[PDB]
Ligand SMILES: COc1cncc(-c2cc(F)cc(CNC(=O)c3cc(N4CC[C@@](C#N)(C5CC5)C4=O)cc(C)n3)c2)c1
């Protein structure tokens with residue numbers, strides 16, 4: 001049983017939820033966590049979805065090395081792990097473990113791209129990267145090693161690369177919202193937050209109500225020609241002139257599982273959206289000692305067969321050594337969206353009892369309706385999870401016009417949406433001031449930064465001033481405390 | 484065009500074949516190679532096959548960390564890469580990159596397994612490992628980083644673990660023989676060659692005729708209780724007694740692509756078995772300037788649609804800036820098994836010309852027969868590739884009775900099958916003597932080791948003596964030079 005309450009000790013609740021459901025295991029190297037099959041299966045599902053979608057765009061998978069030479073990493077010139085010795089033997093030149101693969105892939109890119117006919121070049125890989133920070137890790141959300149995909153494309157024109165950046169960002173919206181039922185906000189990162197060496201960084205941002213923090217959910221960068229200049233990636237037009245390619249890179253990580261967990265979980269533990277649950281329906285037979293158990297289990301198997309014909313993912317928990325009470329809790333903690341109960345009374349009526357994980361609502365369903373009804377219930381659970389989260393997201397954002405409204409909204413664990421002049425020095429000043437005010441507050445018991453400049457801009461009245469400098473406002477920006 | 488001949492400069496031929504077909508790219512860190520999509524797709528295919536098959540056995544995927552602490556690696560107590568510094572900051576205790584994950588996973592195993600009801604525990608992961616040897620690498624076959632899967636299971640009894648070892652070894656036979664059309668020999672490794680700390684190691688072995696070398700294709704270990712003792716992995720029976728679990732581990736790598744390449748390739752370059760080719764049929768339209776090109780390309784698209792309805796994997800190379808001659812060679816080098824040619828004369832006859840990659844045989848096929856006929860041709864190419872390789876394998880093995888027959892058979896680039904007493908010291912002596920004889924031979928221009936003790940044992944006459952000690956022979960053993 002999960003016992004910490006999500007709304008009272010959030011970090012303990014999260015730890016319990018992911019450990020008791022068998023999603024993660026601890027490890028003797030700090031900041032690394034084991035992903036057990038119950039979490040792993042969800043990764044496999046979103047991985048298959050995203051793979052299928054990028055294949056339709058002509059992206060192909062590949063595999064580049066996990067090591068990068070010191071001097072190719074220096075061509076770009078920090079949380080980088082260095083390998084220095086093969087066993088006992090010191091290396092002649094230390095090599096780093098990839099934190100990202102731009103400097104690993106792009107010398108190959110330069111070799112492969114010769115003519116405009118070679119473009120676009122579109123590659124992805126699934127692997128893990130390492131970012132070795134000493135700060136406190138958080139399972140899924142901030143870990144020293146994490147699984148991701150990174151996609152890396154090259155085009156003849158800037159407009160083609162930017163269209164691809166936005167197509168991918170839309171795939172990331174679908175990954176969170178369609179697969180994980182997590183609402184996200186599209187937008188552009190500020191100049192100070194954008195990717196090192198990139199031209200423009202787009203993001204989808206999510207929000208964790210319980211601690212008021214925004215979290216970057218996925219990212220899609222217009223690199224433009226910046227890395228092409230660095231690595232001499234050029235193509236020939238049909239007339240023979242050499243031109244720089246225009247590039248994109250984009251990535252999504254197992255952080256997405258963390259965000260799903262926190263968005264949908266409740267005081268009983270995990271709640272997994274039907275579209276990614278590896279077990280959508282757990283069938284629990286009632287097994288009175290004074291019953292035809294063989295008949296009950298037989299009907300369970302028949303119902304499994306029937307539901308699987310509709311591509312529903314079913315498990316029968318027929319263990320006689322645990323009570324139905326124990327099983328209910330066990331599969332609740334694990335987040336299975338639908339529980340189906342079959343005992344002698346149901347068998348005699350030709351119905352089953354079905355309980356949905358998100359609300360506890362129970363239904364009596366005849367066996368003949370079971371597949372279409374469960375399909376409909378699963379789509380309804382998925383939509384409900386998403387819409388309720390969308391409502392919490394919207395309740396979480398305060399639209400302000402002056403800096404004096406910031407700290408009251410932060411103290412409500414809200415994000416703010418404010419008219420901003422987009423001066424980078426002002427973002428630095430806002431970070432430092434809000435951090436100071438937070439510290440001063442904590443003495444009586446930090447920083448607010450930009451999360452993104454949303455694509456969907458509310459109306460900007462003609463003379464509106466930046467909320468912090470009083471200069472002309474340029475656009476609405478979303479700010480908050482952040483991961 | 485590939486220009487080195489497979490039968491004359493084998494290593495140059497292999498390099499050309501994998502580079503010119505765009506399968507691999509070089510990298511500035513020795514012993515690591517980039518896998519471009521043309522090779523990567525074949526990995527994805529065999530990966531899907533093996534995943535599907537182990538899932539039916541109840542194995543589930545997971546992901547364990549890439550790092551292992553010095554002292555958990557010492558619990559077992561060398562080609563191990565050590566991480567010592569996060570950027571500038573020296574680590575308090577150096578950590579190694581995984582060469583294999585037994586010591587990473589098995590402390591978790593010990594924590595998770597409490598009762599016999601917890602068994603069997605069956606996990607797999609797909610990742611890369613590093614084995615940092617200074618010797619000369621070979622793309623796919625011996626690399627410093629390589630992709631694999633490793634599966635790790637734990638059972639209540641030794642017989643259950645051994646049945647699983649053999650079930651997996653059969654999956655590896657299917658991986659090579661059914662998917663890659665590469666014949667392999669099942670058997671048990673000798674005491675000196677078996678896995679460190681394991682009880683018994685089984686293998687499937689392949690043979691490379693052009694250099695006479697056996698190569699271990701995949702491996703499936705009975706660990707028995709050895710690692711359970713090391714890591715305290717114990718379970719409780721129903722009466723409450725604690726017993727050691729019995730374990731297996733097993734792995735397969737991208738070496739398998741290397742073996743496929745070398746087995747089927749010819750002087751024109753790659754030949755890819757239809758069951759794993761990412762392009763099974765390349766459609767090449769003839770594009771005379773004085774023709775209805777639109778009609779020709781339209782019919783190409785229709786034929787693609789029709790073939791894809793039969794799950795055939797099709798690409799249309801409709802580029803006008805290359806000749807059909809150039810395209811024929813380009814897709815030959817890449818190993819596409821079937822080429823389909825459509826020009827105005829074919830269109831007028833309602834037929835297509837189809838050329839198979841392995842023999843060059845051409846066929847005229849009416850459009851109505853095209854899907855069933857190509858399906859049949861692809862199964863015939865797959866079978867032919869396999870049977871011819873099976874014949875080369877069989878021609879490659881000499882059955883001997885005395886040590887004086889070894890060097891003549893090695894000089895024929897053959898393996899030998901000999902009655903052996905299985906004394907480990909004799910294997911060491913045979914390695915050293917055959918290496919010396921080889922050196923002495925090379926002066927006028929090394930080692931033979933056991934490859935496996937085959938499951939399929941030829942008849943052993945009642946008084947047959949070991950071929951090297953003259954002691955009683957125990958079993959037939961397969962020996963050869965080796966990777
Ligand atoms: C208060 O204490 C902290 C403050 N700041 C950092 C940490 C921290 C602690 C650690 F122990 C280890 C690390 C290193 N891992 C990461 O930084 C990281 C980044 C991301 N990112 C970055 C943005 C991105 C998106 N979208 C990009 C696509 C990639 C995405 O997913 C995802 C994950 C799982 N890990 C950070 C702790």
Ligand SMILES: COc1cncc(-c2cc(F)cc(CNC(=O)c3cc(N4CC[C@@](C#N)(C5CC5)C4=O)cc(C)n3)c2)c1
Pocket residue numbers: 514614615616617618619620621623624625626627629631699700701702734735736737738966
């Ligand atoms: C004459 O020069 C040499 C002599 N001896 C070694 C090398 C060499 C050169 C290097 F630069 C790097 C390395 C390290 N990589 C590997 O040892 C290795 C082993 C395997 N293995 C081992 C057995 C196995 C099977 N079945 C097990 C499942 C795993 C399987 O696939 C596969 C691959 C791709 N790499 C070795 C060079």
Ligand code: PRO
Pocket residue numbers: 100101102149150151195219221249250251252
């Ligand atoms: O790390 C990043 O943000 C980009 C996207 C994945 C590859 N590099």
Ligand code: PRO
Pocket residue numbers: 583584585632633634678702704732733734735
């Ligand atoms: O390296 C080996 O041979 C075994 C099988 C994969 C995991 N460890």
